[PDB]
Ligand binder design. Structure first.
Ligand SMILES: Nc1ncnc2c1ncn2[C@@H]1O[C@H](COP(=O)(O)OP(=O)(O)OP(=O)(O)O)[C@@H](O)[C@H]1O
Ligand SMILES: Nc1ncnc2c1ncn2[C@@H]1O[C@H](COP(=O)(O)OP(=O)(O)O)[C@@H](O)[C@H]1O
Lengths: 237, 56, 1108, 136
């Protein structure tokens, strides 16, 4: 059968059999690649599910986004977006991938997911993954604002600056890390405490307080603490 | 249009197997001909059924 | 046992049988043993059991064999097993004629007759039948053989040959993923065609071509009259081959000898194969064919083989297949990552398809092996038998150099290349592993004839061109990098070497065996922190050049002596940096020769600090270089092709000289957040892809483009954009989007010139007053999105000209007032006019609309022409009071939305038929729900105050009764809502599972036992949600169900194994109910487990269910 | 592979096996990175190769000399004294009462000397021109 005929038969089957959590968590990636393989499939299938019986949608993409999210785990759809980002932004495949993720982002907005709801879906268990550009950017779309995105990830760490900084410093050691954006997240923490007008040594202890064993991530080190203490020291005196 | 053998000889063993068939079979091998030889029938098989298969 | 011997002891146990026993013993054959004390008059059950499992039997026949009822019974059992089971029976006629056995005559017949007196009829019949059958079968006539010992030896040899062939390929079934290859190859075969189809198999060396061929031959050859397999034809061929005809003749001779099993005869001429095989089904496998000579030897024409036959040649370069004209080619693909791990663990942990103990270094080694089954096998064999610390100490050596097992096989294929092909291979391995073919041709075009080299390498399967870029397998790339140290590159005769090594180049740079000319390419990867910059001071004084620099800087730390070292080079060709970590480019850097320049992450500000000359430059990529204020004078850059300022974010303005970039094709200022204007481009620019996605500060634009070839023009956010550049011809607008590009005013009239623009968006384009009148000029325009495009008070009447658009989404256009009227759109699927607060007049385009959505409008009228429109799958209107005078509207409606305030409870809804859905937004002042019509599938009350009574027993179908926030519900109404039988959810305001559901609990578990003998049972389930910060707008929930026993572990089935809704509200103090069917009849064993998919959203709290 | 044996932290190679190894030193080169090196192992006969004056002596990173033959000074061309050699590993067993002015001038002119063994040095002071920054 043609590519469309096969691809429809596959998606219906996966949503029909209700298979394993990890089996879904894998099969979604294969389906995603088959979608962006050639450009004239997203719209065509998005046209097919639009006409099929069910709830109405404002666009073909929403019709396809709803079908995919319902079929595989919604938390799984998030992983497939993160793991299938092509290199060249101007290629055909990158164009298709953007159509998929934007539809899912708009689909989540219409369901009224909070900032925390998106983050919990994105979450992979490694606290540095959130600051990878392929994940951070997709977060921004789902929340429209970096401050909220930073706030959402800050609260997902239980409002722990120590755990927060450990992640952002570990994101400074990535081959494709955007310094300007990662700085904004690093900066963002500061004016939250500058709005608190905390004393520098207190700010040290405030950071050092979570350095204790009150809470499975990688803790900071005292030397870089002082620089962070030094970093905040003069800027907001 | 598929045959496993080119020539199948039929004869009486007690009379011609030793004398003339031998020469005819030898002559065929010298002309690039692969005739069926019953002595080469695999052991532990029914000759009656197997031989009829070679005829067709 | 091995063999079951049957004999008559009194005749042969002493003389001949002992010799056969001795021969079998010396040939490693263990026949079943028996004793004369171990025999009764009958045979016994254990004797038959031994016979049945022997899997081969030898019936030695003597004169008095028939004179023992024991022996006759043994023979009868042997024949019975031969006919039923696959037992193989061999016969020895010890000085007795087979005809005598057949007719039961002679002395043998006399003994048989004397033995047959007294027996019942069936015993005699079975004995006679067995005797006849055993006389028929082909055995060994003792009289024919001149030499008894030779006959016994021949019998032993035949027994041995027909004993080491029972188990077919029982071993080495531990090879992974062969089913995919078999299925993908069956389509190529199409054995049903009865043709002589040729089939090729090709791929990089070390994928499994030989193994795939062996597996296929093992699986299919039994279906062919005459089948043979030739192995490693390339290796077994004379390398100089002074007489091609003699080698050709001997190759065909080997093929025929192995073909007919015809004892290595000698062949007269080259046409014999046709003479023999043109009239028989043939399956032929030719492995590792290198050049057309072997193909001409073995299979030159289709007509060489009988009607219906398959010949399969496995090669390594496509050119050989193509020359012979095959066109039925399977390009063998790499196995999946899981299959790769299975192969590696098979070869490393001793038949364990999974790992053992640790499962950590295994995946590092696997990833090191790429995906070649050869690489996986070699690494697994190298690592097997060790322990974890031994693995860890072997790992770095394995990583820094590839095993000689892989190296030799790769080297053999590498040596079969032309010299320029070898040079291109080295170039790709060292520098351009993953680059566009066009850039490779542009950079290496004056050396190697790049196009032909790439064509040959792709044919040889030493490289693959996926999409527009080349890719070489990492295992092969490592070989290339290694050979780059023990080999040179020549162009005319100048010797070159490529420097590739992670910080292991620095030693080579600190040398005096130097030329300043040997090295033209550098590929440096600097991920780790620097201990000290290992370059010496003296080498900094050198003037050595490089025509290719590619540095993957990866840290915040800055390299200075490396910079000073590279920029001494007078004529660089291509420059690649990542994380340049410096403010400018040094002034002593010459760029007259510079074809490609990319610094994909940088801290460059106002680089070059003055004008330079850029004669042959064709690619500039300053992406992500956020700390970049402006850009140098691009005058005299006429040959520039593409410029990618991807996400520079501090580019205040663009140089005025952009006018002179005549050859420009691609202009990508994606985020580029600091831009204000965008200067005019010129006349012959012909921009092909113009991307400005989120230029939030971009205000001005050029007045014109000259967009003769403009595939894509994207301005997604671009919030403050007043006007828009005109367009000339737009003959190829593959893509134009302005999603949320607010603060626009108009649209250039030339937009209608785009004849092929299928899709078009303006969602969010607020403050857009009117569409251009030329929109109708567009053709193939299929999709037209407009959403909350307020202040669009018109719609041009030329739309009727379109005649192809399927859907026209026009949502939230609060000021749209009229629509064009005298229009019929021949194929218009939907028309989504929601919340068009001032539409005020029914949209009448007399068409074949199937989905009409008119909610929140202000039409308050329905025309009479609508009966001309026979099908409507969805006609949705917001209820106004004066619908009652439009009886033509009622029967052709689907949905309805009562307003914020409707006291009346409309009985008319009973008459009106198609009510797939009915929605009640707000309506706090509503006495009760209206009596539901027979066709009701959906009921929604998103917010409500009083719904005391629901006076209607409705039982249409799988109906959804959603009541998100309505507490004044009478008990009978509530009970009706729970106890209505449906196949979907039903959701109520409640704070506790109702007592109606007896069996209660709180990955949660529900336990109950059922009172029934044997039936299919039906269950009603009730679920609350864990108290969380549920969003008021949360609108999505799916639930999975698992039912299982504890007396047994039978995971039973459950017909509605899931319930999903994309519109149900998710809230805390609410009751969700649904229904289940179970059919398996493990009586007193019921355990339920309801899970909420998306635990990040909803988690199941309390739970309680009921039976029926 | 049973080509060497480690007894008590010291490696041991069999006499015949070592003798085979020494012969192949002349016929085989050593590649570390992109460079190429060879070794000089001989009782006294391998010294005229230093007087060849026609081949690149940079590919000589190891010297193993045994001078338990004569107190006579070994013969080197004055031009070979001009060339500076990059000798990283030096093992000289200069067992005699002789002093080797020529050998000292030839070796201690090396810029970087990784390891230096000299048995029976038979001199008074190490020459001042001997660089020792690299000396393990
Ligand atoms: N099952 C058997 N195993 C071994 N030899 C056998 C068997 N049956 C018959 N023979 C041998 O065959 C010989 C008789 O051959 P005969 O003259 O019947 O050949 P034929 O029937 O004329 O052959 P064809 O039918 O091919 O012309 C006997 O001497 C006997 O030794
Ligand atoms: N599907 C498989 N499962 C297990 N082992 C395999 C598989 N395919 C190949 N191998 C192993 O990898 C090696 C690759 O050899 P192969 O690729 O068959 O030679 P060639 O490159 O000449 O075809 C073989 O030794 C084989 O045992």
């Amino acid at each position: 059968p043609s590519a469309v005929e096969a691809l429809i038969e596959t998606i219906d089957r996966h949503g029909r059999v209700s298979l394993n959590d990890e089996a879904k968590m894998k099969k979604v990636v294969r389906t995603w690649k088959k979608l962006i393989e050639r450009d004239d499939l997203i719209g065509e299938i998005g046209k097919h599910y639009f006409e099929a019986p069910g709830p109405l949608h404002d666009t073909y993409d929403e019709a396809l986004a709803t079908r995919l999210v319902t079929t595989y785990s919604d938390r799984g759809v998030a992983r497939a977006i993160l793991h299938t980002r092509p290199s060249d932004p101007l290629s055909k495949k990158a164009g298709q991938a953007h159509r998929l993720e934007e539809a899912v982002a708009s689909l989540w907005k219409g369901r009224g997911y909070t900032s925390d709801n998106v983050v919990s879906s994105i979450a992979t268990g490694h606290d540095v993954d959130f600051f990878a550009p392929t994940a951070f950017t997709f977060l921004v779309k789902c929340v429209e604002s970096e401050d909220d995105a930073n706030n959402a990830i800050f609260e997902y760490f239980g409002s722990n600056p120590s755990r927060y900084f450990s992640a952002v410093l570990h994101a400074m050691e990535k081959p494709d890390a955007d310094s300007r954006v990662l700085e904004s997240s690093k900066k963002w923490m500061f004016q939250c405490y500058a709005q608190k007008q905390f004393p520098t040594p207190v700010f040290e202890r405030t950071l050092a307080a979570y350095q204790s064993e009150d809470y499975h991530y990688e803790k900071l080190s005292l030397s870089q603490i002082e620089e962070l203490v030094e970093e905040y020291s003069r800027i907001y005196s | 249009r598929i045959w496993k053998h080119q020539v199948f000889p039929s004869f009486h063993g007690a009379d011609v197997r030793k004398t003339i068939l031998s020469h005819i079979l030898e002559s065929f091998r010298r002309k690039g001909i692969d005739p069926f030889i019953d002595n080469n029938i695999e052991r532990s098989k029914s000759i009656g059924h197997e031989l009829k298969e070679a005829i067709k | 046992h091995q063999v079951f011997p049957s004999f008559h002891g009194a005749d042969v146990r002493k003389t001949i049988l002992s010799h056969i026993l001795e021969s079998f013993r010396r040939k490693g054959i263990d026949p079943f043993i028996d004793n004369n004390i171990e025999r009764s008059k009958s045979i016994g059950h254990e004797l038959k059991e031994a016979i049945k499992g022997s899997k081969i039997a030898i019936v030695l026949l003597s004169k008095n064999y028939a004179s023992s009822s024991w022996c006759l019974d043994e023979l009868a059992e042997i024949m019975k097993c031969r006919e039923l089971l696959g037992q193989i029976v061999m016969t020895i006629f010890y000085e007795v004629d087979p005809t005598d056995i057949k007719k039961q005559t002679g002395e043998f017949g006399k003994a048989f007759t004397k033995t047959c007196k007294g027996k019942t009829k069936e015993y005699v019949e079975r004995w006679r039948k067995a005797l006849e059958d055993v006389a028929t079968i082909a055995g060994y006539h003792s009289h024919k053989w001149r030499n008894e010992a030779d006959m016994i030896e021949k019998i032993a040899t035949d027994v041995s040959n027909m004993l080491n062939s029972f188990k077919p390929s029982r071993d080495f079934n531990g090879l992974v993923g062969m089913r995919a290859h078999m299925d993908m190859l069956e389509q190529l075969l199409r054995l049903v065609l009865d043709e002589v189809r040729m089939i090729g198999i090709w791929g990089p060396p070390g994928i499994g071509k030989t193994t795939i061929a062996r597996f296929l031959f093992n699986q299919v050859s039994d279906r062919f009259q005459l089948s043979a397999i030739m192995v490693n034809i390339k290796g077994c061929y004379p390398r100089p081959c002074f007489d091609e005809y003699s080698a050709q003749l001997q190759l065909q001779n080997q093929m025929l000898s192995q073909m007919i099993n015809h004892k290595d005869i000698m062949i007269s001429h080259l046409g014999v194969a046709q003479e023999r095989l043109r009239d028989k089904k043939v399956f032929l496998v030719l492995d590792e064919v290198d050049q057309l000579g072997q193909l001409d030897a073995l299979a030159k024409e289709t007509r060489w083989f009988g009607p219906g036959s398959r010949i399969i040649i496995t090669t390594e370069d496509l050119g050989v297949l193509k020359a012979h004209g095959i066109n039925h080619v399977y390009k063998v693909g790499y196995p999946s990552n899981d299959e790769a791990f299975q192969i590696f663990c098979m070869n490393a942990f001793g038949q364990k398809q999974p790992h053992e103990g640790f499962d950590e270094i295994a995946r590092e080694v696997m990833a090191l092996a790429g995906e070649l089954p050869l690489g996986l096998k070699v690494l697994g064999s190298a690592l097997r038998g060790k322990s974890k610390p031994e693995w860890e100490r072997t790992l770095p050596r394995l990583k820094t150099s590839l095993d000689g097992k892989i190296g030799s096989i790769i080297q053999f294929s590498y040596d079969a290349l032309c010299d320029e092909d070898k040079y291109l291979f080295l170039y790709i391995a060292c520098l351009f592993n993953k680059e566009s073919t066009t850039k490779v041709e542009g950079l290496l075009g004056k050396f190697l004839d790049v196009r032909q080299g790439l064509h040959i390498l792709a044919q040889k399967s030493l490289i693959s061109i996926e999409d527009g870029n080349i890719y070489m397998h990492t295992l092969l790339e490592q070989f290339g990098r290694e050979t780059s140290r023990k080999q040179f590159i020549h162009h005319g005769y100048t010797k070159h070497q490529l420097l590739v090594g992670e910080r292991d180049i620095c030693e080579v740079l600190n040398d005096d065996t130097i030329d300043s000319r040997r090295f033209i390419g550098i590929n440096l990867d600097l991920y780790k922190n620097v201990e000290e910059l290992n370059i010496s001071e003296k080498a900094l004084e050198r003037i050595h050049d490089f025509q290719f620099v590619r540095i993957n800087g990866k840290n915040h730390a800055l390299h200075e002596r490396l910079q000073g070292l590279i920029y001494q080079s007078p004529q660089i060709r291509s420059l690649h940096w990542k994380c340049y970590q410096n403010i400018c480019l040094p002034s002593t850097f010459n760029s007259e020769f510079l074809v490609e320049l990319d610094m994909s992450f940088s801290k460059l500000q106002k680089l070059w600090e003055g004008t330079k000359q850029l004669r042959n430059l064709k690619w500039m990529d300053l992406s992500y270089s956020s700390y970049l204020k402006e850009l140098p004078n691009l005058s005299t850059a006429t040959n520039l092709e593409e410029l990618k300022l991807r996400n520079c974010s501090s580019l205040v303005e663009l140089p005025s000289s952009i006018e002179k970039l005549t050859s420009l094709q691609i202009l990508d200022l994606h985020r580029c957040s600091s831009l204000v204007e965008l200067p005019s481009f010129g006349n012959a620019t012909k921009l092909e892809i113009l991307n400005l996605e989120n230029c939030s500060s971009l205000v001005k634009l050029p007045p014109s483009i000259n967009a003769n070839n403009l595939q894509e023009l994207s301005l997604t956010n671009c919030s403050r954009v007043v006007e828009l550049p005109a367009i000339e011809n737009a003959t190829n607008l593959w893509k134009l989007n302005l999603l949320n590009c607010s603060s626009l005013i108009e649209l250039p009239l030339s937009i209608g010139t785009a004849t092929n623009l299928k899709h078009l968006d303006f969602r969010g384009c607020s403050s857009l007053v009117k569409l251009p009148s030329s929109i109708g000029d567009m053709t193939n325009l299929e999709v037209f999105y407009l959403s909350n495009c307020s202040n669009l008070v018109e719609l041009p009447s030329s739309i009727g000209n379109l005649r192809k658009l399927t859907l026209l989404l026009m949502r939230g256009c609060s000021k749209l007032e009229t629509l064009p009227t005298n229009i019929n759109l021949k194929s218009l699927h939907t028309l989504n006019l929601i919340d068009c607060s001032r539409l005020k007049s029914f949209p009448e385009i007399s068409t074949h609309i199937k989905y009409l959505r008119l909610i929140g409008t202000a039409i308050k009228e329905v025309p009479l022409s609508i009966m001309s429109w026979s099908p409507l799958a969805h006609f949705q209107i917001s209820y106004f009071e004066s619908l009652k005078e439009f009886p033509h509207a009622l029967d052709i409606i689907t949905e309805l939305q009562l307003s914020k305030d409707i006291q009346e409870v409309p009985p008319w809804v009973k008459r009106m038929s198609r009510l797939r859905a009915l929605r009640l937004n707000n309506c706090n002042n509503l006495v009760s729900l209206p009596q539901l019509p027979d066709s009701l599938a959906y009921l929604y009350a998103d917010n409500c105050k009083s719904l005391e009574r629901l006076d209607c027993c409705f039982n249409n179908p799988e109906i959804r009764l959603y009541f998100p926030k309505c507490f004044k519900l009478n008990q009978e109404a509530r009970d009706l809502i729970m106890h209505t039988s449906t196949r979907n959810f039903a959701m109520l305001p409640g704070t506790q599972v109702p007592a109606c559901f007896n069996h209660r609990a709180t990955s949660l578990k529900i336990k109950l036992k059922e009172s029934p003998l044997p039936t299919t049972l039906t269950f009603k389930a009730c679920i609350m949600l864990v108290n969380e910060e549920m969003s008021y707008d949360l609108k999505s929930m799916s639930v999975d169900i698992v039912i299982r026993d504890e007396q047994n572990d039978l995971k039973v089935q459950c017909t509605p194994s899931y319930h999903q809704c994309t519109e149900i509200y998710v809230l805390t103090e609410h009751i969700y109910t649904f229904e289940l069917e179970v059919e398996e009849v493990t009586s007193t064993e019921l355990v339920f487990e309801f899970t909420s998919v998306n635990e990040s959203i909803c988690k199941i709290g309390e739970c309680g269910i009921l039976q029926r």
